[PDB]
Design a protein around this ligand. Structure first.
Ligand SMILES: CC(C)(C)NC(=O)Nc1ccc2nccnc2c1
Ligand SMILES: CC(C)(C)NC(=O)Nc1ccc2nccnc2c1
Lengths: 281, 281
């Protein structure tokens, strides 16, 4: 078969699956999660070590051996995917609590010059087996760091190709891809079904996305509020320059909910209670 | 003032300007050129060391000290810019001989997955103070190496933003920017004047380039053949997918000249005569 590197084994006791395995830190006897990647990962480590937000996964340790071993904080609730798979749907209030945190996490990323590029329910982890819990964004493998165009625009464009001058119009809107993904994640969570699919349709998946013509099933959406649907509509905008940003989404009436914001602050206080050092009064 | 690093001084005797300075290799008593860059350059060195073409500049040595020192083969003819500056124009046959070599050099680059991105007469060097000479492409500082889109297209685009799917149409045509630049270089060489400028015009430089409406002065161009002008027209095409490639330019009637091709092969044989090792018959 295979063995774990001596350096990992020195600090951790490996266990069962959820490539992700459960492990125990020898020093603390505390549960951790170990992500095994087959031998970009160094950039992901550099990105993760620099970011500090409660809704972004923290790297605890790293091992560069026959494979890459990434030690992360364990998330007992698992993937958001498991909560939405096979037409399963979350109650509106739960969608809000989770989405609000996805918005704060993605806003933090953009503020810090990072675009995730791979936001999906599979990359959103829940902190507990309870409905009201803290969420954390994971899988920064496809992430990009925010140029060649700015340097080119400093000189006289005597020899500069027209497509380069044309691209100046859209430049610096790559982050809007994360807002599209969040739009799709919100649609799935609220309805239990994807907005764009090849199930019972003649239109190609490419054509549904470029046209922005999402599959709307009234019977399913009648159960969901008009405010939630309005936010979805504003994130699922084809023009990335017109699409809602994380700030615009956070200002939307749907998230102007003092109850949901309180429940989140409560989950924060409960998580932070373990780490809390006494303070100067 | 300042001093040169001990390691450089150990191997070279520095001299007059043409930041580029003349130097003498101590071992050979041969003239070299030393490019001084103020403390990307490592990528340019990596690019230059890997490429082997008679129309691309060769790096002879490199020094990473208080500044970057790049030892290159000396080009006694200097810049092509000096031959075209202030309405000065080359005789058609000379434009052909030089352009043919720029096409071979740029074709070699594209074949090898490199885009120069900064082709101008200032970055084209002539090997001798004679009209018929070998040319060499220099200044690979802005060059790019040929993706994230291909990796994204492997998965299901359920969460994939429409602008990404839209970009699939143009993807892999960045090299066409080099063909635009060559188009502009050919226009300047043949006419002595730039195709796009802010001299005696109301239309903005950005607007002239995006529209592809080059300044055509009949009196100047009457002296130039219709074949040369046809090639310019085919390189100065706004749509990068329609624009002529180096291969298409090389197949153009204007370059189907057995005399010019012979003169180039002759200059090659003359340069190669010094290095020529005896061979197996
Ligand atoms: C809830 C259950 C079924 C035990 N799964 C789970 O905790 N999965 C994961 C998966 C990936 C993880 N990656 C990092 C941290 N926790 C993780 C937990
Ligand atoms: C002809 C004259 C006036 C003596 N200039 C010249 O050789 N200039 C240059 C400039 C940059 C160079 N870079 C590399 C190699 N030769 C170079 C020669």
């Amino acid at each position: 078969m295979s063995v774990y590197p001596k350096a990992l084994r020195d600090e951790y006791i490996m266990s069962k699956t959820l490539e992700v395995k459960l492990a125990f830190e020898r020093k603390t006897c505390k549960k951790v999660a170990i992500k095994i990647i087959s031998k970009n990962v160094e950039t992901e480590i550099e990105i993760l070590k620099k970011l500090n937000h409660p809704c972004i996964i923290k790297i605890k340790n790293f091992f560069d051996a026959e494979d890459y071993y990434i030690v992360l904080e364990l998330m007992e609730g698992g993937e958001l995917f498991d909560k939405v798979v096979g037409n399963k749907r979350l109650k509106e209030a739960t969608c809000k609590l989770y989405f609000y945190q996805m918005l704060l996490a993605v806003q933090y990323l953009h503020e810090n010059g990072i675009i995730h590029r791979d936001l999906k329910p599979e990359n959103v982890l829940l902190s507990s087996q309870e409905e009201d819990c803290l969420i954390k964004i994971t899988d920064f493998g496809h992430s990009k760091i925010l140029t060649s165009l700015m340097r080119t625009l400093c000189g006289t464009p005597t020899y500069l190709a027209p497509e380069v001058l044309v691209s100046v119009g859209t430049a610096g809107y790559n982050r809007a891809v994360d807002c599209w993904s969040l739009g799709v994640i919100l649609f799935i969570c609220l309805s239990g079904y994807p907005p764009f699919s090849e199930h019972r349709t003649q239109v190609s998946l490419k054509d549904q996305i470029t046209s922005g013509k999402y599959n709307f099933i009234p019977e399913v959406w009648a159960e969901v509020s008009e405010k939630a649907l309005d936010l979805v509509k504003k994130l699922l905008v084809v023009d990335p320059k017109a699409r809602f940003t994380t700030e615009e989404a956070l200002r939307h009436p749907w998230l102007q909910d003092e109850d949901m914001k309180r429940k989140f602050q409560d989950l924060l206080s409960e998580e932070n209670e373990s780490t809390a050092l006494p303070q100067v009064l």
